[model samples]
Target: GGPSFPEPKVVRSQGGLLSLKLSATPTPLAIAGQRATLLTYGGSFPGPTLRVRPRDTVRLTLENRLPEPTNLHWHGLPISPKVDDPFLEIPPGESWTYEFTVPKELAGTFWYHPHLHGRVAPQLFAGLLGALVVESSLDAIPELREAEEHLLVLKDLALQGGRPAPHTPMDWMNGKEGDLVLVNGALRPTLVAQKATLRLRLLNASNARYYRLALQDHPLYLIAADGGFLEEPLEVSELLLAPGERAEVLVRLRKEGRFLLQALPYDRGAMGMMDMGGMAHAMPQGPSRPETLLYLIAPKNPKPLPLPKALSPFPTLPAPVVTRRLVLTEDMMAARFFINGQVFDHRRVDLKGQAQTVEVWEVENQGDMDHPFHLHVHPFQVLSVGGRPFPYRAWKDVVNLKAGEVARLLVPLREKGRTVFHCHIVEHEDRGMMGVLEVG
Candidate 1:
């Protein structure tokens, strides 16, 4: 199910120099049984890491070798839709080359994967994804390379027989529950590390789950959010990362011993059940389920280093002149997910706001199932949860709104366009869980 990075493949920064190819191949993976059909790239669950720097041009040759239509979405990238762009759905057995310049504004952990509607969950479940590391320019942070770098991507795999679990339309429309946790596409991986200063780039790629990341032995120093570095390192014991979100943390490996980076659930597992209309899919009545997604292996050799006491601080936002409360709900018997009793219409501009203005939004989830809420373009700082100020106010692109829980955030709109806010659960998003917010 998990394979190490294939021999080092390097792409230069010269114009028209970056090249990559992605294909959906059927690979037999260890699931519950000895083997199962797992849709993978080059015979691995988490595809190879595509490393590049800001301002570098990337020429990606996407080959749809799968049996069905597939399209690549540069998740977290600021690129817009082009011909065969991020949203163009590629037909089966076809190929498309995407040529674009990586914006110098973004320097952090991003990801890429299929985004075809109705098939997002299945493709992701079968393992069609990989990491995209946007390295900081030399002038931006020359010491970043010297910092210990770790790529950590978290996913919730529904396992039938200790392998990837399949999905149905109903499962997508509501939610897909999983029993296995994977980090970097490996289950229960042993992490061994040498003495060094580690910079961990963490990504939340799960479709329906929310994770509270924590190390069993030490505190985490948060240095950045989705877009880039924070103003200063925020020390915290736990950080909540929802689907499509990313965080960079600084960890010092003082001892050569091993430690487990665990993601524990903050909410009750009962909140994951579907209660939509006409859909009989309900949460199984039983004890709460707890799952672990990351296992860290530390090497025996130790390096003596001082953990960075400070990091670049993110700029403060202006006061919000406007505050909005958006309610998320669902009609179980009718099987409809709604916002304030209304469904989403992609064509319509839902909320219009001025660029460069600070807006406070209170997003409340009133349904039974958990919605990993996400907004595009603008990153927000968590102000409060359940009406109380949040413990961690770090910037976040995706925030989890549990049943009956409300998240208060401050949004600094940086771009003017028709953007979106919706459940990161692709099926729920496709089933009218998405809404647009336009900045003028």
Candidate 2:
């Protein structure tokens, strides 16, 4: 049981300044007569959709009304520490102001959510997330400018007695995954659209679940990756998104029909095994059930637009000035996780770089699970994966590494300040899979 699909409120910049007071409040949510109390930003489950232009200044004031400390992270934005710092804790009954200028080159689909180290999973599961759109001249393309658009935030939540439930101990070890899938906070919602080209901005805000999204009989034209648009569109039958990842796609509805945006089953090989001091034990497999996320209903007389031949350009990476190697591992006996054999310490700087310098980072995962690596203040280009060169180039702030896999990244440390990089799995991050980086 879930609520009816409700449109999210849109917040736009007025006179180059976007100001808002976002606070968590207890709100009543009813799903087919089952009522639950949940914490929300601005009293809305999915918060508000923030729309801004490139180079515009955003002045956001966040107040923590919850019983604990929390902070917000601007995912996918190359913001300086002056505004993008996620380590600043906003304790209960206190408020903080965030002010920053969006870089002109960073125009795409991004998001914001609580990043409190030990409470990210539960806080997000309690419904404190929002969609952020950075606009640019790139949207002037005919196909993009005229297409019908939708912002879909994919999330999951476990319920008990009709209210959001906390994860179990086993859920933490295996990453908390919910039984019900939600899009824009609605269960199995239907989207009504005209017979025209449709543009969808998909954000995976789930705690641990990965999605293989596809339209029943249509090819997805991918125009944008995690951070920004691709140089050229890439068509595929399905798109895979891990936590903290986003993708923008365009699809054409030729005729009147009912199409489904479905989530296909994902196979996480060997992820259910518990490692106890080299002895492996099998855990019950979490649900990977396939389900339809959105039902698309389009009328006849479709107005289709031609896909753009080009979208955006990838930033050129400077010659590498230094190289850093990092290993992601888990200490089963200690029940702890780490980067380069060390747990996260806010006072310790694990990596350092000079401003305006480019570095090559080789990240290897030695554990038997998947970890999506994310960095703040800078987006990177994938050099190679598992010894093979990536077919196409795109800007990405988060990269997924499977067990026994390695990734080579060329990062331009253009911003100066102290920021952090860590696994995007909130639970794993809360458990210490993180490191500090200083570029100054």
Model 2 alpha-carbon drift over 4 Å, by segment: 1-5, 269-287, 332-335
Taking all chains together, the TM-score of candidate 2 against the true structure is 0.94
TM-score winner: 2
Error of 2 at 340 (Å): 0.8
**Residue 423 lDDT in candidate 2:** 86
Write one digit per residue (lDDT tens) for candidate 2, span 1-440: 23234557889998888999888766888743367777788888688989999878898899889989889999888988767886799889999988998887787899999887878878888888898999879888787999887888988877887667877665666678776788888888888775389889999988778888989888899998888888998899999899899989999887778899998987543245555564454553544779788898875788688999888777677699999999999764444779999999988998989998899999998987788899887899988989999656788888888888899999988889999998888778888899999988
Q: Candidate 1 lDDT, tens digit per residue, 1-440? A: 24232121333455535687767777777643356667776566677677777777788887887889888877666654452242467888888887777776567777777767557777877778777777765314533556656678787677565446667545655556566677766666665554356678888777766677878777888877776667667788888787778888877666656577777755523333445675565554323244665555555565645545555555677899799888988765455677766777655777888887999998999987667777766768888878887655455777777678999889887766666777787667766677778778
Best by lDDT: 2
Q: In candidate 2, what residue range of length 10 has the lowest lDDT sum?
A: 278-287
Each candidate's clash count:
26, 1
Deviation (Å) of 270 in candidate 2: 6.9
- The parts of candidate 1 lying over 4 Å away from their true place are 1-17, 29-33, 41-43, 81-87, 137-147, 159-164, 168-170, 268-297, 301-304, 318-324, 333-335, 352-359, 387-395, 414-417, 438-440
